[PDB]
Design a protein around this ligand. Structure first.
Ligand SMILES: [Zn+2]
Length: 1037
């Protein structure tokens, strides 16, 4: 809101200073072009430190920090008592006009004290809270020259010729906070603040601001009509080339935005909008009662109603759909009860000072809060008795936190609230040091010293935006900005550039990657994104209803994905149609109960149902008749028990919610220990299995000891936290060299010989996608591949392999792979061609949602995959060969069961393999098949490296190439393990890693189709990760 549509005023509001404390001291400056008021910053600007009360006959005028005048009728005896103005009912005026006057703010529980000066004018002399924390305002020769805060600091305000030039912290430390200059007519021409903006302002003779600018890129020119109304704005970089039209007889203002849209606002006598029409003709109406909003109705006709109690607070909100929210307050305006649908009631209790001492949640569980006499929160007790404690420094900022397990965290902040140091419960200290640039453009440097010896530097520019970041290895990422703090470029440590361009309303319209290709976004007049064209040239088009809800996605092949919504903005139906035919190809339904909770999702291949308790916790998820049931800890709302097909698991948790015991199906329990930083140091079973883990000073996993029953593993990182060494008692030593982009360029595994057993050498293109992969085996070249991306996706690849003969090498393989994508960006064919041989061709079939529904192998075998309404693959079948299938059970996003299906289509539920996860975790803890329990040991990315029996016997060992190809050789009777990176499952018929929403090729390092969430997943629509030992992608997004 730069322009007040009801009056034509140009409006600005900027933070000036914000000091921490028991009673925070914050100052802002508010500008209105037609304003008649004044503040410490001179005419036209108002502020919190210049509020006043004025006698004007029989009423008292209250001028607030925005220059708004509120009227209070003076009683005959001249004594106010909880006197309210109906326009702003939360302000309560008390006191004898012969003594001193108090404005109490019911929203904040804070009070302003006004003292008689001259001519029946009362100036602000103090602000305080209900604890006596107080800021005293000192005026000399009529000017505010000092402030004393009861926390123990003072400010000094410096004036020259009755113009404020400086605001300083005076004691206990000297610090300039604000510096001001003025134009020839006394208007504020420049305001430099230490914590926020540094701006310049230009004005006409009347004080109408015709220009404002920041330190670098932002400069805006404003034009007024002769009546002082804003008629246009324009920045020097082209943004917000806007015009304003006025109609005083119709009471309708028109906003002509820079991209051709037209918005009309009808307003009432108080200048409040009663009817607006957006650039698409969509209409919104509001009903007002003395500045209080009584109802609003959107473009679909959905009405929200507001009721108020006798004290002026919102007492009831009627939401569309018949839902009501009820609010109750104590005598001071503090919220004591919130009643929501489903008989959900929140209760708050306050003591005599207004401290919230007891919260009762909708389940009737109580949290207790204890406070100091100055209002510091000292202690919180949770329903299960978990107790948090805090102590504070002289500015009442937290300096020590005692967690429920007794662990103490030490924090230190400066007078401006910047963090200076943290010491965690194990005694490891991280330090922060700040320094201001003195030469050149006014900027700053923040240095971070970490307890593992890592040093990082973050630089800010003159706008206090991040300018560069230098990691512990000295690699620097830089940032560039245009006007209005728009990020226009990111420069990687290797010097490659990512760039962004915006339209005249600052909507992102173009992204250019390091390769130099463009991603384009297109908007309608209301700012809705109606089209995007990715780097491949693929365009998706979007349609919207009157509420801005997206109701159709159109794909290049002509298929449409139609969506329907409930009154509460929930998807009730999804339809697939194609081309101009309105014929529905497929249909998906979503059913919701009376509380708008999802109870059933259904497509052609799966019905998924959910059951809820009164607390809206999920007590059961059922997929195609297979039911998982949950029970919950009554104090923590964590899963305490889950049962599927008569197999029950029990979870025991400590005060912090950490897992202390896990048990399945009457087996010996697994017990777990955690350190004072909440990190797991051991898991044990009395049967014999034992795993101990240790961490770096910054909490990186760095050590594992277990105990064909003994494992010793060490992980070492560089100062940028790339994993550069693995010492593995079962595998050898892995050494990784990294690029400036934190990608691994050389990965070697070494045994007891100096010559490495195997090496991978990688190169990457400008987009960081794989190009070269060379392997060596025992020091001699083994294979070499070179793959080529076009528009960010692998398109072809050459591969050779060598045989070591006799000291020479002869080529034994030489083949080219080509990839073909359809117009929707999905891989439909991968062709491997070695000269003189039969071709090896994979074909891929896809549905409208870009789910891989079919696969054809080079030998002609056909597989079919089916998916539930949430993209979870529920089945796999071979349709033309005598081969078994698989059914899949899920809990939420976790694959919990693979169920073998015989060739006749009969599921073998007794042969199910259960993968055990903590609820909502992607890191597997155990495995249960045919009554046999195995425990996992996982690596730094949560991938299983070993499976162990209950007594600790190692019966499965993984062995991988960098990008995930698993080739570990294990005994015939070893348990199967098809899990790979988090959320991945290897399909043995293809070698693909199924990865929830997409399939992953661990050779090319890429997914087989474009990211279904587009740019929301990053700018590399096919990549998996820049470094598979540092990043994960469990949903395939
Ligand atoms: Zn008056």
């Amino acid at each position: 809101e730069p322009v007040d549509i009801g009056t034509g005023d140009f409006l600005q509001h900027f933070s000036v200073l914000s000091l921490p404390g028991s009673l925070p001291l914050t100052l802002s400056r508010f500008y209105r072009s037609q304003a008649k008021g004044t503040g410490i910053f001179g005419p036209k600007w108002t502020d919190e430190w210049s509020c006043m009360l004025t006698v004007h006959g029989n009423d008292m005028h209250f001028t607030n920090h925005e220059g708004v005048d509120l009227y209070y009728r003076i009683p005959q005896n001249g004594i106010f008592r909880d006197t309210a103005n109906s326009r702003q009912a939360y302000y309560r005026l008390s006191g004898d006009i012969r003594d001193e006057l108090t404005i109490f703010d019911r929203r904040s529980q804070h009070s302003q004290i006004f003292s008689l000066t001259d001519n029946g004018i009362y100036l602000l002399s103090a602000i305080h809270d209900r604890y006596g924390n107080r800021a005293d305002f000192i005026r000399t020769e009529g000017l505010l020259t000092g402030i004393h805060h009861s926390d123990g600091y003072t400010l000094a305000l410096g004036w020259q010729q009755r113009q404020l030039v400086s605001i300083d912290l005076a004691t206990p430390q000297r610090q300039r906070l604000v510096t001001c200059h003025y134009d020839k007519n006394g208007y504020l021409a420049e305001c430099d603040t230490i914590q926020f903006s540094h701006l310049w302002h230009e004005y006409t003779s009347e004080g109408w601001m015709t220009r404002w600018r920041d330190t670098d890129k932002t400069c805006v020119d404003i034009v007024y009509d002769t009546l002082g109304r804003t008629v246009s704005t324009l920045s020097t970089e082209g943004y917000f080339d806007d015009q304003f039209l006025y109609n005083d007889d119709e009471k309708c203002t028109t906003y002509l935005d820079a991209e051709g849209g037209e918005t009309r606002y009808w307003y009432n006598g108080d200048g409040l909008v009663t009817r607006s029409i957006d650039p698409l003709g969509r209409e919104e109406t509001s009903v007002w009662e003395n500045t209080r909003l009584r109802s609003r109705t959107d473009a679909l006709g959905r009405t929200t109603a507001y009721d108020y109690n006798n004290e002026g607070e919102i007492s009831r909100v009627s939401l569309p759909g018949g839902y009501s929210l009820y609010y109750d307050y104590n005598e001071h305006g503090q919220l004591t009860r919130l009643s929501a649908p489903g008989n959900q009631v929140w209760l708050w209790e306050y003591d005599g000072k207004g401290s919230m001492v007891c919260l009762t949640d909708p389940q009737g569980r109580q949290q207790q809060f204890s406070y100091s006499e100055h209002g510091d929160l000292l202690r919180q007790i949770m329903p299960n008795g978990a107790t948090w404690r805090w102590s504070h420094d002289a500015l009442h900022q937290v300096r020590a936190t005692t967690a429920p397990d007794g662990g103490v965290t030490q924090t230190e902040q400066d007078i401006l609230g910047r963090l200076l140091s943290v010491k965690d419960p194990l005694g490891y200290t991280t330090q922060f040091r700040y320094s201001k640039n003195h030469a050149g453009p006014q900027g700053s440097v923040e240095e971070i010293r970490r307890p593992d010896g890592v040093r990082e530097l973050m630089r800010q520019n003159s706008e206090k935006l991040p300018e560069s970041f230098t990691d512990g290895e000295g690699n620097t990422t830089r940032y560039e900005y245009g006007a209005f703090d728009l990020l226009t470029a990111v420069i990687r440590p290797d010097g490659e550039r990512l760039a962004c361009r915006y339209d005249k309303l600052t909507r992102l319209t173009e992204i250019t990657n390091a390769e130099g290709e463009h991603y384009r976004l297109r908007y309608d007049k209301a700012g809705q994104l109606v089209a995007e064209t990715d780097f491949t040239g693929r365009t998706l088009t979007y349609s919207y209803d009157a509420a801005g809800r997206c109701i159709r996605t159109t794909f290049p092949d002509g298929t449409h994905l139609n969506r329907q919504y409930s009154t509460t903005d929930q998807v009730t139906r999804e339809e697939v149609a194609q081309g101009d035919s309105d014929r529905v190809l497929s249909c998906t339904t979503f059913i919701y109960d009376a509380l708008s909770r999802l109870t059933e999702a259904r497509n052609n291949d799966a019905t998924v149902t959910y059951e809820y308790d009164d607390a809206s916790r999920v007590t059961a998820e059922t997929i195609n008749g297979r039911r998982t049931e949950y029970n919950y800890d009554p104090d923590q709302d964590t899963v305490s028990q889950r049962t599927t097909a008569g197999i029950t698991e029990c979870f025991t948790r400590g005060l912090t919610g950490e897992l202390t015991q896990w048990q399945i199906d009457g087996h010996t329990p697994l017990t777990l220990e955690h350190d004072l930083r909440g990190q797991e140091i051991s898991r044990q079973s009395e049967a014999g299995f034992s795993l101990r883990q240790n961490y770096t000073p910054t909490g990186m996993l760095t050590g594992q000891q277990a105990g064909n029953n003994t494992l010793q593993r060490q992980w070492l990182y560089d100062k940028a936290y790339n994993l550069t060494m693995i010492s593995d008692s079962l595998r050898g030593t892995m050494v990784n060299s990294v690029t400036a982009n934190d990608q691994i360029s050389h990965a070697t595994w070494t045994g007891s010989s100096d010559i490495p057993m195997r090496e991978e050498r990688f190169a990457y293109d400008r987009n960081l996608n794989i190009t070269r992969r060379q392997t060596q085996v025992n020091g001699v070249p083994d294979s070499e591949a070179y793959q080529h991306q076009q528009h960010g996706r692998v398109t072809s690849r050459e591969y050779k392999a060598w045989r070591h003969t006799t000291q020479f090498v002869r080529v034994i393989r030489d083949e080219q792979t080509t990839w073909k994508y359809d117009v929707n960006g999905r891989l439909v064919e991968k062709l491997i061609d070695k000269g003189g041989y039969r071709p090896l061709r994979w074909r891929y079939r896809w549905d409208a949602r870009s789910q891989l529904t079919g696969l054809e192998t080079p030998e002609g075998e056909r597989r079919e995959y089916k998916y539930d309404p949430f993209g979870r693959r529920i089945s796999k079948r071979c349709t033309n060969r005598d081969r078994p299938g698989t059914d899949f059970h899920w809990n939420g996003d976790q694959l919990t069961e693979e169920i073998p299906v015989g060739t006749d289509g009969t599921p073998e539920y007794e042969n199910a393999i259960r993968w055990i996860y903590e609820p909502g975790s992607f890191t597997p803890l155990a495995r249960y098949e045919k009554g046999q329990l195995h425990y996992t040991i996982t690596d730094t990315v949560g991938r299983i490296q070993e499976l162990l029996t209950e007594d600790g016997t190692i019966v499965w060992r993984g062995k991988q190439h960098l990008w995930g190809r698993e080739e570990g050789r294990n005994k015939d009777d070893a348990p199967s393990c098809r899990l790979r990176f988090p959320g991945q499952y290897e399909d043995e018929e293809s070698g693909l890693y199924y990865n929830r929403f997409r399939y992953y090729d661990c050779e090319a390092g890429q997914y087989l189709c474009a990211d279904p969430i587009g740019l929301r997943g990053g700018i590399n629509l096919y990549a998996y990760a820049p470094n598979p030992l540092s990043w994960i992608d469990p949903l395939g997004l």
